[PDB]
Design a protein around this ligand. Structure first.
Ligand SMILES: [Zn+2]
Length: 280
């Protein structure tokens, strides 16, 4: 499923409601939440995963009894054990969820989840990816009241997250899963059908060797134009030109990861309607 292909490559009666979204170190979208009425804490907005996972420091917090236990991986870089709890999540202005499943890391390697998230300074991952047909695992947004649960508009350059039905027309909409089939074009080459993950935590992104016609293990050369269209090739989702400090890493296999680029460019709506698609 999506989580198997999710990698963060390091280069180094309300219908709607908005909250601040802080961009940290250009690429990291951070929002603040309170768990069970606790202190506001930063979490990383990650469209590439589904699930709220908190650093082990949260074991000191009162989330009630452990309701479940497990082991998982995050973003291809951290292996961890976790406890599951049922607790409320508040985004402020009493925008409060029903109690819902929240995981807390009990041990991890290499290092802690907070250390792994050091680029953002976040202490948890707010995985808001849609996850159709996997009823066990859902974005915490689905536990918001009334129409607030329909989806979230992420607008990094405006500094905002808006819960509820989309209030903008066209734009990019993520639905079904964080991976969808689109068409990808490098420079003025052919449009190629490809699975792509729109991953707001993916930094400067990755592109597979076969798709890019480049050897794996280094970055795409600066001055390379990348354009991503709907699968039919008729509508441009986004385009940019790589730079020496903003360029995807070339992987052997796997799927292309957009990283922050499309989010920095455009408001992107994540829909939780039953339905992986991306439309423009
Ligand atoms: Zn991610």
């Amino acid at each position: 499923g999506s989580s198997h292909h999710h990698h963060h490559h390091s280069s180094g009666t309300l219908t709607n409601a908005t909250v601040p979204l802080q961009l940290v170190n250009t690429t990291e979208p951070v929002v603040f939440i309170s768990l069970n009425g606790g202190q506001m804490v930063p979490v990383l907005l990650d469209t590439g995963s589904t699930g709220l996972v908190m650093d082990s420091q949260f074991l000191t917090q009162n989330f009630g009894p452990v309701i479940g236990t497990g082991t998982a991986g995050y973003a291809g870089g951290l292996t961890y054990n976790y406890n599951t709890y049922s607790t409320t999540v508040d985004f402020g202005n009493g925008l409060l969820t029903l109690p819902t499943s929240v995981n807390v890391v009990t041990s991890s390697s290499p290092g802690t989840l907070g250390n792994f998230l050091s680029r953002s300074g976040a202490v948890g991952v707010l995985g808001i990816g849609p996850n159709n047909g996997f009823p066990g695992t859902s974005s915490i947004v689905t536990a918001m009241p009334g129409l607030l649960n329909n989806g979230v508009l992420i607008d990094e350059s405006a500094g905002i997250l808006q819960f509820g039905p989309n209030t903008l027309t066209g734009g990019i909409t993520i639905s079904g899963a964080p991976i969808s089939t689109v068409a990808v074009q490098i420079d003025n080459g052919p449009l190629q059908q490809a699975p792509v993950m729109f991953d707001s935590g993916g930094i400067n992104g990755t592109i597979p060797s076969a798709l890019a016609s480049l050897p794996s293990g280094g970055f795409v050369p600066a001055g390379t134009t990348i354009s991503v269209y709907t699968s039919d090739g008729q509508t441009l989702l986004y385009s940019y030109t790589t730079t020496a400090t903003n360029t995807p890493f070339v992987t052997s296999g796997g799927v292309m990861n957009t990283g922050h680029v499309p989010f920095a460019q455009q408001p992107i709506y994540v829909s939780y309607s039953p339905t992986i698609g991306t439309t423009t």
